[PDB]
Paper text:
Thus, lipid transfer proteins of the Ups/PRELI-family shuttle phospholipids across the IMS in a phospholipid specific manner.
In contrast, substitution of K58 by valine or threonine substantially increased the ability of PRELID1 to transfer PS, but only moderately affected its PA transfer activity. We therefore incubated PRELID1–K58V with 1:2 DOPS-DDM micelles as described by Watanabe et al. for Ups1 and PA, and following nickel purification, and SEC were able to confirm by MS that DOPS was able to displace the E. coli derived fatty acid, albeit incompletely. The PS molecule docked in the observed electron density was found enclosed within the cavity of PRELID1–K58V with the serine group positioned at the bottom of the pocket and the acyl chain pointing towards the entrance of the pocket. Interestingly, in the PA-bound Ups1 structure, additional space was observed beyond the phosphate deeper into the cavity and in our PS-bound PRELID1 mutant this is now occupied by the serine group from PS.
Author numbering:
A (entry chain C): 11 to 183
B (entry chain F): 2 to 183
C (entry chain A): 11 to 84
D (entry chain H): 12 to 79
Amino acid sequence: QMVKYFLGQSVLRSSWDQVFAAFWQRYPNPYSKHVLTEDIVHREVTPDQKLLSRRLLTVTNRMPRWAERLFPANVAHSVYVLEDSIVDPQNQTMTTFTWNINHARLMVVEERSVYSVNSDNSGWTEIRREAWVSSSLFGVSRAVQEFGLARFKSNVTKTMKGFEYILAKLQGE
Amino acid sequence: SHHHHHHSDQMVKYFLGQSVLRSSWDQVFAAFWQRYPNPYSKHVLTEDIVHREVTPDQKLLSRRLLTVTNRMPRWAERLFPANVAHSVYVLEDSIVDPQNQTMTTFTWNINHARLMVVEERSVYSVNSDNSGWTEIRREAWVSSSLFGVSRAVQEFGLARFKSNVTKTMKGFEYILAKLQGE
Amino acid sequence: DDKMNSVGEACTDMKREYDQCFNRWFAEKFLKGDSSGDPCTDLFKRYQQCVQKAIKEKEIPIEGLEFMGHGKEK
Amino acid sequence: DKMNSVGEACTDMKREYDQCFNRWFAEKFLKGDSSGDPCTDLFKRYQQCVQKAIKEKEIPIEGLEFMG
């Protein structure tokens, strides 16, 4: 169906205090081999004491050997991803929203995560995520389909014209 | 009477249309091999017959090969610059039944298969309303490989997201281990 | 002038006489009843053995498809 | 140890703002609001440098609505 939707729930075992501060110290680490740069490009503080922050970061592009073939356009370009973080300690919660800003053509993946203290354990921190994978390429295949029938509809009319015409040319030599 | 309609069938488009020619059936069957050229055929370039034979039952089985001009709309040369170079080659097979006074035709393109495929099955039969007229029934299907890839690109995009999410969590637990001492 | 070109640019020559043969055939005595004799076969085999050359040298993918939609239905 | 940045000029530079911000973040932001931010005198220098490096790489950011 049009845009795919993902819902995931996880918890990692550490104080809400201790992860929010780890959130800015994760890079590098062995598993994030694919992340290349990371930058904090805006960061304000509200009147309700919340840390609004926008972090851009470039990631290597890794596609399956059929995709480069169909999209040579975007193989030697990496992915720029933006992350929007609001941090709330008064409530002990943090919500992030993340998504690519190039390769928009062929796909946009985008994630609203929420980080809060685990419900049944208070020394831990639950994490909710909802995903939306989409691709403008559906609209395209519609366009190619709509254009292709319209051409066919005119080209059927031409056949009748050309058919009626040459039928007339045969009657009485 | 003359009319047509089309509606999306599954993820492809179905077209159904009915037309009648104001001539006898024999003339149209005989005129079906002559229609090219004509003033409205400016798009077809060649026409050949690559296979033909007479069956036991006295039907004529023919296969003719046209090659027609591919003019796409200008937004679509941008997106598929590989396709603009090549003319479309079309095969339509046909059988002619003299005894039952009917002929059926199946036509579809055999290049640009990756971009789009149009297929048309028309049947030419003697009219029941008049009897000096030929009734033509034609149904068609326009499909595209792009719908499938749009799903592949989505499926792969989701996959890589899931792997990337384990790597964040299994890279998160690790930094937590280095500050906890561990 | 008036008739239709072909894929084998040579065979256009070879094509257009077989075409006019076949029509004279088709209409006179195939569509009308049974004649049971085909005077056009003789010429057909040279004509199309000339395009059978042509379709390979321009690599058009006719072979591998079957009559009607049994080969490629959608 | 060093992550790098979009502007190679300001890689080590971030590493200074970074270590500042965590100490600030961890010591007196979760514990309670306390006083204001000290890293602003370094952060101002960092942001200008970064903005320059993105226009060099023509990175989109049409001031996009926060949270999309």
